[PDB]
Symmetry: C3
Subunit: 283 residues, 3 copies
């Protein structure tokens, strides 16, 4: 299924009928960081498998629902069960849900992820407001937009200079200051490693030399599809570990350790993003 105007429209038509929610904000949550979705009010849970033209996710298994409802007085749509490119999903499969969000009315997409810290200032449990990226798949002919352009959504050659909205980064930082956790909050450049192997020690050392502050396996594809169709983005990485320090100390990177950091910060991140949602401009 191509992520075109007709196919995205058919999915949005189904969702509009079944949900009766017109969302202004979209959310995609990192692993272990999805509990805000469980707290959506007046919520409507729509399995991906029920939505016309949504990507098939049964090979990977696990949860796959679109959840619509109200958070902090705003109407939102959430992806419960993120699609990651290391699973083998195509460019079309990644793009269609974001384009459906656009047709549903989403103007702002909020994204969280778990990432490795490269910059020396970053400790496990820190947050990084993403201000730019290095898209290794994109440089390497695996950009999420490779393929025919879908003109109804955006231009053939998008500029990414404003992919990460500055005002949204400023609002996120302001809320952290108001709640006295700004000492945890940094800003930085995200390197997209296609994955699914963690960054090797020597890849981490290369990323250090190349300016990269954090590395992870997601986010950049969704950012690009959103930017292409005019959706503003705030993307926040939770630092699971400092990969440069771990390489210096012969310490392994491990998904169980990553998820334990997610559990440690999950409630703070939920509170933060709920307040961001309530504070977003009405326009």
């Amino acid at each position: 299924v191509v992520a075109n105007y007709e196919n995205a429209s058919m999915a949005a038509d189904y969702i509009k009928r079944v949900s009766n929610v017109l969302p202004d904000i979209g959310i995609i949550c990192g692993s272990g960081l999805g509990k805000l979705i469980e707290e959506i009010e007046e919520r409507k849970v729509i399995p991906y498998i029920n939505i016309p033209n949504f990507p098939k996710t049964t090979v990977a298994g696990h949860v796959g629902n679109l959840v619509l409802g109200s958070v902090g007085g705003r109407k939102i749509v959430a992806m419960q069960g993120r699609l990651h490119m290391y699973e083998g999903y195509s460019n079309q499969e990644i793009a269609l849900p974001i384009r459906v969000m656009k047709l549903l009315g989403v103007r702002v997409l909020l994204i969280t992820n778990l990432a490795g810290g490269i910059n020396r200032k970053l400790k496990s449990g820190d947050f990084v407001l993403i201000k730019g990226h290095i898209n290794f798949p994109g440089l390497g002919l695996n950009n999420v937009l490779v393929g025919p352009n879908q003109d109804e959504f955006g231009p053939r050659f998008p500029d990414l200079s404003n992919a990460y909205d500055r005002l949204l980064q400023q609002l996120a930082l302001k809320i952290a200051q108001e709640n006295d956790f700004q000492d945890l909050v940094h800003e930085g450049v995200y390197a997209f490693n296609g994955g699914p192997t963690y960054e090797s020690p020597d890849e981490s050392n290369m990323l250090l030399k190349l300016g990269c502050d954090v590395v992870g396996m997601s986010t950049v594809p969704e950012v690009i599809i959103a930017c292409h169709c005019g959706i503003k983005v705030l993307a926040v990485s939770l630092i699971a570990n400092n990969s440069i320090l771990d390489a210096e100390n012969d310490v392994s990177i491990n998904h169980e350790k990553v998820l334990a950091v997610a559990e440690k910060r999950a409630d703070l991140l939920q509170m933060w993003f709920k307040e961001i949602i309530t504070r977003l401009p009405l326009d």
Copy 2:
């Protein structure tokens, strides 16, 4: 359709019949830089769609013709409607037209493109004679030659040390000096970004650290196919903007601005390449 000897031969047989032109030189022109093709003498226009085994281009649409005729006393073949890998064309689809050029008798391929400037010396409207490249798709398992080798055209492992012919670069510079526009002409290393998103500000900053002088979304695949089958190459980038300066000044990159630079330099580039063609050696 595989870009093999039999299939390329079938395309060349059709072209030889319909055109009656045996070209010595091939040309592939950047966007907005194609007007020389409109000035080919005694010309024969062959739609790609009519040529056996040529790639289907109707999804992208727009023009797709092979144009044969005379420029500056030399017999040439031009691609009117370049095939770009960000459109989703396969390695086989990119390679077949160049291999057809080889079977038609092409010994020299002239290429122009529009690119972003990384080196600080580069201003909008400058020309860069490409002297080498950094092929991010190639490093990343998306080299245009991935797949079975077609032994009749070239070796399994081509060396790229002489992919950009030195004598052709020297001739291009000499003609610029004779016409007093050598102040516009630089030389440099081309980074291939698969695209189609423009280089992000942080990707540009990385390319600066990595020695790259210019960045763009084309050219390297054609250079490699030509080098593989023994065709000499001259490749010239027209600098649309300096991406490092634009990132420092929060200035966007935009295809309309790119095309306006192409329009500003199109006539000078046509005159330059016409003279290069007339001055090429007969052997």
Copy 3:
């Protein structure tokens, strides 16, 4: 054919019946470095084409056999006819033979390759014990593990911090010292260039800036599949040429020159690896 548990089991069942050899060690040899396979004792040669679910290799042609037998008192299985990703083999085709090795009982995989030297200390004919890697395909969404995870073999997100076993590197160096060829032996980081074009002069210069010591077109995919399923790895590069020096001197890289270096060091490498095999721990 997916490189899953059922399919790998069917291949291993066939091999166990026909060979009567239960191997503890696997070997994959670089081009021109395969003569140890010819010296396997009590050997059983099994054409890939006869093994259920093994990848089809007839388009590339050339030899394709699994060879089982005894070397230095240990039971081994060798791939005679390596599968390279620049040929177009899929992730599944690369992974299945290594996973078959795992089901056959392989605990240690020994790998050799031919590579370009980047580090200035490296001369043609030197050996590099690989201690880490920079996986450009992996960063670029072409990691050998992209696709559904096969849980029976390993985790979704492997850590590569111990992909190159330290004790095996130490044993290899110790044997070189005992035989007075330690002056040829270095250690270093391997950059994976998908290929099949040799590293361009400017790619080599970039790799120098990025810490890389050697560059080649293989090995990293097999290392990752082995690491994913718990097989320890020793990987050794034979330096065919110093690409930085060759770029400084306008000297070409050439497969015939590469193979001549392989021939010059083939007998020493066979003796070295035979002794490594005899000296490997029984556990």
